């Protein structure tokens, strides 16, 4: 962290910090707190850990007048595959947004299993729109989230109800969900795709659903790509 700070405040360059197995660090801190015979918190964590964890999240951010940028991207393993744990809860509440990995999609055999439901980004606001990527960015993102959620509810419905995929809407929702899961969700590990390619792929993946089926898309966004 001090190396990244020295890189940002002196060398003036883009720096990216990454902490591996932060869960072990939290367990170690909990051990040090336990050895001190102090008041233990959730999962044996320290009481001042809130300030400690913040100090781990304070290794990011840029400065005024500095061309360089330091951004910390820590990584930890949620205990018993539970994001409800104090470590993941604090990490999610402190930092803006979190990347969640589903075990089922990883057990599917497909490429990287990111769950869009739990996953979110607070920096996706100012980084979207025209001048950055595209004006169709935010709209297609919200539409993707809505389609994924609708597909999830349609999946739960498909589990509870019959195999008829609950009439029409839920069928197209489930189809689009599976399609986005087998294509948009898995880009491959050795493949690097641009934003335009992903936008075109999403435009092709959204062709299965009707134009009036998207309530998350505005009039301009609906008239954006008819190609």
């Amino acid at each position: 962290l001090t190396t990244a700070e020295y890189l940002a405040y002196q060398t003036e360059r883009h720096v990216l910090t990454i902490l591996t197995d932060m869960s072990s660090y939290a367990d170690a801190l909990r051990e040090v707190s336990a050895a001190r015979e102090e008041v233990p918190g959730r999962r044996g964590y320290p009481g001042y850990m809130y300030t400690d964890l913040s100090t781990i999240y304070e290794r990011a951010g840029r400065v005024e007048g500095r061309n360089g940028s330091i951004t910390q991207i820590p990584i930890l393993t949620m205990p018993n595959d539970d994001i409800t744990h104090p470590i993941p809860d604090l990490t999610g509440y402190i930092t803006e947004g979190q990347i969640f990995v589903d075990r089922q999609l990883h057990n599917k055999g497909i490429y990287p299993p990111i769950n869009v439901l739990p996953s979110l980004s607070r920096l996706m606001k100012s980084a979207i729109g025209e001048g950055m990527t595209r004006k169709d960015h935010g709209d297609v993102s919200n539409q993707l989230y809505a389609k994924y959620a609708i597909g999830k509810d349609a999946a739960a419905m498909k589990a509870v109800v019959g195999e008829e995929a609950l009439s029409i809407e839920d069928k197209l929702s489930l189809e689009f969900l599976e399609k986005f899961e087998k294509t948009f969700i898995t880009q491959g590990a050795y493949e690097d795709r641009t934003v335009f390619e992903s936008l075109d792929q999403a435009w092709s993946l959204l062709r299965i659903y009707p134009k009036e089926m998207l309530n998350r898309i505005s009039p301009k966004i609906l008239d954006e790509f008819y190609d």
């Binding site: 015979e37 008041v39 233990p40 959730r42 044996g44 018993n80 595959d81 539970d82 409800t84 019959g162």
Partner: protein
Amino acid sequence: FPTRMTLGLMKTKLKGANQGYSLLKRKSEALTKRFRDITKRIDDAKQKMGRVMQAKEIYSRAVETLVELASLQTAFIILDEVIKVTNRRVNAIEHVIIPRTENTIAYINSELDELDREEFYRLKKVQEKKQNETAKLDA
């Protein structure tokens, strides 16, 4: 996995499955009665159509009613199939979903109670440690 919110969602889904089970049961009963009446009507229509089988005009007003009765018969068969699906759904809402939800709720309750017991034990140990330290400093 063992959270109070998850327990609430599971309990809500369980209650909803119960109400849905009752509704599906009543619907199965009504469908059974309707299919029964339509069955008796199907037998009556069978005897009626079997009355005259094997001349002048106006025969178009004859086979039409028989066609309507046939439509009622097919609708009765579809009603029987739908009643079967409803009965299957009721059977799936009885010993399957209900038992799974109950067992899951029980295990989750046990896990939560055990965790709370462990936390309370740790807190009691902390309080005992503080009390022991205070009693040691008092001397």
